[model samples]
Target: HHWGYGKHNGPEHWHKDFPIAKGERQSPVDIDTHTAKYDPSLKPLSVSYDQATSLRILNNGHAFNVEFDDSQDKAVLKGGPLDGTYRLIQFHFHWGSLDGQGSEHTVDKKKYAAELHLVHWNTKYGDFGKAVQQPDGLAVLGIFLKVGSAKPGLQKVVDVLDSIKTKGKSADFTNFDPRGLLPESLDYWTYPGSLTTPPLLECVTWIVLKEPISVSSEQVLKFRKLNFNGEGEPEELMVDNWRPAQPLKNRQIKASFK
Candidate 1:
């Protein structure tokens, strides 16, 4: 009844249930750095996240998400390809079962070990539900993860993975600020695209950072321990939970910096 990253119900077959999956504005497009045009009008991204807004961490079958309290503007993202303030809703990761093949959006066809998506909904559109239906409603900040030294900031999330190993499992995860996970350079490439997952709405303004944060290889392996199946069901490890790059037809990728 749900779509996943498998041979049968994966991205290839998503168009059957969600026809937008094959839409022109679909996401996870390959970012060819050389061809991206620099846009001087694009301002630096403004990210103000309140550490106290973190609510809980849950395994949503597709990916594990650290949800935030978006009741107010305590944590918001602005500037850069966005026209209005967007409340941070949740952040999730996508990774491969093994090293070197996880990140969704590639740069010059280069892949990373994993990728992080910080989802935000535009307040101008009222709420997350309504926001997702508009062309300029959501902004997803994508950050790539490279394998190297273990990152202390990311370790906080990794430590709690064991508590929510199965789908539908959740645990209180407060006082965690996601800002620490960003790369030093805010340089990015912006484009209009749809959600990488099912219900693939063409409503996201994708801002993918050029630089990547480092995490040890061992840390990534722990993510595989999560099960896509819920309790009392046969175990299926959640890995390669990423959609391959889609066609970038009739679209332009604007770079925030040269």
Candidate 2:
């Protein structure tokens, strides 16, 4: 019955509530930072955003996802030695409370301030949904966020944060450019991984950017204003929304440059 848990049903207590959930491949918390030596062969392909095909804002209230449909049928790989066409599928983010961290990738066992995921599919194979089942079909671009003096590259998103601050609330966004959220440099780390969330398909080729984007402390606070209510008693206010780190399982991470 799509049983899930969070503040109202804390993840730590999930196994007790839903017995099947215990075997699910939970995300973000499953990364192993020092399991294997780093390689340079796994890197992201250079992506040039054309026009956004569509922009959809999900009505999740406290935490929402703005999906951007791309006009380009293929994305070119330039930074890494691997040359190929990867099609953009979707992108989303993970956040936390006002004083807590909410990043997926951990550095030396420390979580970042925030995290963004841009998912793509290798067109050389087929559609993204189908490729998601293959080992070399998916490529996810991960970007980290930190508090600093530098302005957020994509402040446009903040302006609408208040609109969907409540649970199950949503709105449509137009003329939005997802590329504006990318860091200054495309230098990234790549590896064969799986989706951080449940149904953790092991077909993902993750490309995590080395350089992180800067945002003010207030920007992070805005994220905490969201609510998680859907149709019943307000589930809970969004806070400390992060998954614990996971194990590497003898996997190696590759970077664009040595």
Candidate 3:
């Protein structure tokens, strides 16, 4: 069970609810792209997602995101071969300091309006943290968000955002499948990387999709409306919830179709 900030549920009070999650990486503004290096060998694999997998949604109030269980069974890596199968763990978003830019990956230092991360883990490894330590342990599917067409596919998520507008509050969601949110093309950029969060383990097989998904300005506004403060007295408005770019450490980002 998850808890949100309030008289009893706040970030500061989370240790009491789930002691194991105490040191787990919590989200709230930490994305950087200035240090990213691009490689031409990274490309997308040809695979389709099956709809038979079950999906789960929670509105714990601290944030709005979806968790996809065991759906990564069909993701295929085009060039690289690994012994493990992956599982879709969770999907979330990142916004910028303002309306115009806010993503972890930058194209020639240009930031998009927002970014979405579809995080997956290698089931062969048995544990998420352990899996993140190997070069092929994790696979993160990224999609850029621009202010244009309304993303009907994302309506499943936005429709529930209002229900958990307050901290520490959440609701149940159903009849939703995440594959519909994917961009049309599977073309992507792949690389050996690490988690964007702290501890920044270098165990990810990064698969960044080439195409971006569109979202309405109104949807972006809803993301901006989210609060950064823990539940309680006053709310700390969430403005720039992005991490500054990290050093590439001489790593090369390879693309597939190059």
Candidate 4:
């Protein structure tokens, strides 16, 4: 396999299969707020999502994703260091195989239980895949997850995880309002980086929220139950499907709030 989260097939080995794995703009870098420059020009993030755009959920071998119908102008993201309106494409998570080891990006060297990604592509590029090739083409809203009560909003997603527990499995998951998962604050840090996975394209403009939403211990355990292996194969649990933090390089980190 070209990639996986195992000791042999994982992050450190991605470059063997994908050259950009060692690119300077790689993502999931650590954030030290104390050093982040406050950019007063950064606008408040504006989001308009249509619950109906949530088409379905799937287990894509690595992570479970709630894919959206991006054709309509129903779901959109703008402002906050962006030069154009971007359409919501899909939302997914990266977590550790277990508790205490999930967050892809850290703050002040602190990791969270998991991380949520709301992937969007700039409308100017016409589509997500094409957007992946252009600078300023993608904007991902990163939300951290903490261990706590099963927040009602998250329970909705958790309830469906059982239906897509194995690789390639999927189920209809319409009309779910995805924003219920975001924290109260939209304040965030911005940087130019690449996707955290294979084809690690340096097309992302990361807008990672400072606040994290809550999830129950049980909710997190379900993430561990996903199978990385398909039918007729020896089972391999899908856990810690996250890329390690890369070098920050000569990039400036911008903050939306003081």
Top candidate (TM-score) = 1
Candidate No. with top lDDT: 1
User: What does candidate 3's lDDT look like per residue over 133-169, in tens digits?
Assistant: 6767877777878888898878778877766565565
Against the true structure, what is each candidate's TM-score?
Answer: 0.98, 0.80, 0.74, 0.97
What are the lDDT figures for the candidates, one per model? 0.93, 0.64, 0.60, 0.88
User: In model 2, what lDDT does residue 81 have?
Assistant: 30
Candidate 1 lDDT (Cα, 0 to 1): 0.93
TM-score, cand. 1:
0.98
The order of the candidates by lDDT, greatest first, is: 1, 4, 2, 3
Q: Compared with the true structure, what per-residue lDDT tens digits does model 4 show for residues 184-238?
A: 8889999999899988899999999999888989999888888887766788887
After superposing all C-alphas onto the true structure, candidate 1 shows an RMSD in angstroms of 0.9
- In model 2, pairs of residues that clash are 27-196, 29-244, 29-245, 29-246, 30-245, 30-246, 31-246, 45-77, 62-226, 62-227
Report the Cα lDDT for residue 147, model 1: 94
lDDT agreement of model 4 with the native = 0.88
Residue 231, model 3, lDDT: 56
